[PDB]
Amino acid sequence: MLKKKQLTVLDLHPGAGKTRRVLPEIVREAIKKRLRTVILAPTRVVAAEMEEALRGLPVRYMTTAVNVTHSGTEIVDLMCHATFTSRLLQPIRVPNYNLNIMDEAHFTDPSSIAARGYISTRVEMGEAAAIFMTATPPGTRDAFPDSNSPIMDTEVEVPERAWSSGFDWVTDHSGKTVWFVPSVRNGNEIAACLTKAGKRVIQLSRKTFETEFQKTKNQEWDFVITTDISEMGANFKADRVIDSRRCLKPVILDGERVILAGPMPVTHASAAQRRGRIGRNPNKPGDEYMYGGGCAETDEGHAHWLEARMLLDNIYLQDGLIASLYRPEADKVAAIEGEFKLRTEQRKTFVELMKRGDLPVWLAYQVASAGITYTDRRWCFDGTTNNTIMEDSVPAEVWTKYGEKRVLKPRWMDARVCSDHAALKSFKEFAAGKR
């Protein structure tokens, strides 16, 4: 696999040992051939799992999730997918890695899609080798792949709100369950219901993942309520998965705003990854997978793929050339390569709005291309009356950096800035000039 001009899709079933057995072997061979190597982890929890698998091998961990003293003589770097894309965007020089290994290469966040497009373009140009590690590569139509032990699959009605009766099977269980919900707000309602019934519940989401995941090992639990984030390597010691088979989809309407459409069916890849959390111990057959809906290819027209093109149009590759999206996922967006390319100063603003401002890619692009500087927050208050952000059924309010009390009415409306209590609290601080 290690020869140039070759991208290998390592697609063993979930739990086959791609991380703990296959990855150290690849790394030993790459170190033997003096290949400059990058290992890309989806999250910080996977990066820590990787240090345990690669202990004793000379790897430079470019993450603060690991506390290692680096010798300064390593030719293998390990960083998160987002870190790689971030450094490609920033003026920091990134080595031209001879071998690029992406673990959990099915991740659909904009920074992951952009990293795949960049790496696969370098391979197509004959400059590098690449290994994409995932049981569910782009385009997969099998939601029921192989497992370490047999799984009991059951199509059943799954509650999406609190309930009083009709779902005795949910609470009559004596093992541990991992339940996938379409959103944080939906997970809160179901968690409150289970807690009221005497259950011990832990809730996972993107912003709280590293902190709350530790609780699955530190304390006894009955249920874990999670969003799609637990599809990226998150290992659990569970005997059941309750899968709503639903997710929210960001959609750009009329090129003017972003809405959170749905809940709608997950892809075949997501359903297979959610099921993949159980049936992993060959000595414990009969883990349960209860699913409450079907799959559809909801990745078509999803805004993440448009955002990855916004990222790639602003990364240098060679003169005026721009990296293309990885061919199996290149048709999910109707976008012309280069249409989002910004000049030096607007690009610098675009980067800072995502990196420091913590804004979604699409929203940061609208601000930067309009000629607005990073610290100028006047667009947070001068939008139309139907762009008013609502908190507790009343217009949200902030004190501006001038000391004036104003209604949050952004010129560009992106539903992700107020999708939950935490996101809106962060957007209020941004609009106030607090970061």
Ligand X SMILES: COC(=O)[C@@]1(C)CCCN1S(C)(=O)=O
If binding is defined by CB under 6 A, does position 346 make contact with ligand X? no
- Rounded (10°) angle between helices 110-124 and 303-312: 50
Nearest distance from C-beta of residue 81 to ligand X, angstroms: 8
For position 367 contacting ligand X by CB under 6 A, the verdict is no
204 is in an annotated binding site: no
The site that binds ligand X (CB under 6 A) totals a number of residues, namely 11
For position 199 contacting ligand X by CB under 6 A, the verdict is no
Query: Which of 354, 368, 398, 418 is the binder for ligand X (CB under 6 A)?
Result: 354
Interacting residue with ligand X among 86, 149, 188, 387 (CB under 6 A): 86
Q: Does 43 bind ligand X (CB under 6 A)?
A: no
307 C-beta neighbours (distance < 10 Å), count: 27
- Which residues are CB-contacts of 24 (< 8 A; sequence separation ≥ 6)? 53, 54, 57
Residue 85 interacts with ligand X (CB under 6 A)? yes
CB of 246 closer than 8 Å to CB of 160: yes
Minimum gap (Å) between residue 212 Cβ and ligand X: 18
Establish whether 16 is an annotated binding residue.
Answer: yes
CB of 249 to ligand X, least distance (A): 18
253 annotated to a ligand binding site: no
The 8 Å CB, 24+ separation contacts for 389-394 are: 389/417, 389/418, 389/424, 389/427, 390/418, 391/418, 391/424
Instruction: Give the nearer residue to ligand X in terms of CB position, either 106 or 274.
Output: 106
Helix H segments across 81-183?
Answer: 81-89, 110-124, 168-171
Q: Which lies closer to ligand X via its Cβ, residue 92 or residue 334?
A: 92
Q: Tell me if 81 is assigned to a ligand binding site.
A: no
Is there binding between residue 242 and ligand X (CB under 6 A)? no
Q: Rounded to whole angstroms, how far apart are CA atoms 240 and 286?
A: 9
Q: What x/- string results for residues 304 through 343 when contact with ligand X is judged by CB under 6 A?
A: -------x--------------------------------
Nearest to 74 by CA among 92, 97, 44: 97
Would the annotation count 139 as a binding residue?
no
Whether 12 has a binding-site annotation, put simply, is yes
Residue 366 C-beta: closest distance to ligand X, Å: 15
433 is in an annotated binding site: no
> Which of 122/347 has CB closer to ligand X?
347
15 belongs to an annotated ligand binding site: yes
Minimum distance between the CB of residue 82 and ligand X, rounded to whole angstroms? 4
For ligand X, which is the closer residue by CB, 88 or 191? 88
Distance of closest approach, residue 24 Cβ to ligand X, in angstroms? 27
Q: Does residue 130 interact with ligand X by CB under 6 A?
A: no
**Segment near ligand X (CB under 6 A); pick from 78-86, 151-159, 262-270, 371-379:** 78-86
The separation between CA 6 and the C-alpha centre of its own chain, rounded to angstroms, equals 26
Contacts of 286 (CB under 8 A, 6+ apart): 149, 150, 151, 152
User: Is residue 361 within the footprint of ligand X (CB under 6 A)?
Assistant: yes
The CA distance from 410 to 253, in Å, is 16
The answer to whether 39 and 164 are in contact (CB under 8 A) is no
Considering only residues 94 through 123, tell me which ones interact with ligand X, judged by CB under 6 A.
110-111
Distance CA 322, CA 316 (A): 7
Coil/strand/helix, residue 118: helix
Quick one: which of 47, 59, 89, 266 contacts ligand X (CB under 6 A)?
89
Using CA atoms, how far apart are residues 278 and 238, in angstroms rounded to an integer? Answer: 7
Which residue numbers belong to the known binding site for ATP?
A: 12-19
Which residue numbers belong to the known binding site?
A: 12-19
Binding site for ligand X (CB under 6 A): 82, 85-86, 89, 110-111, 311, 351, 354-355, 361
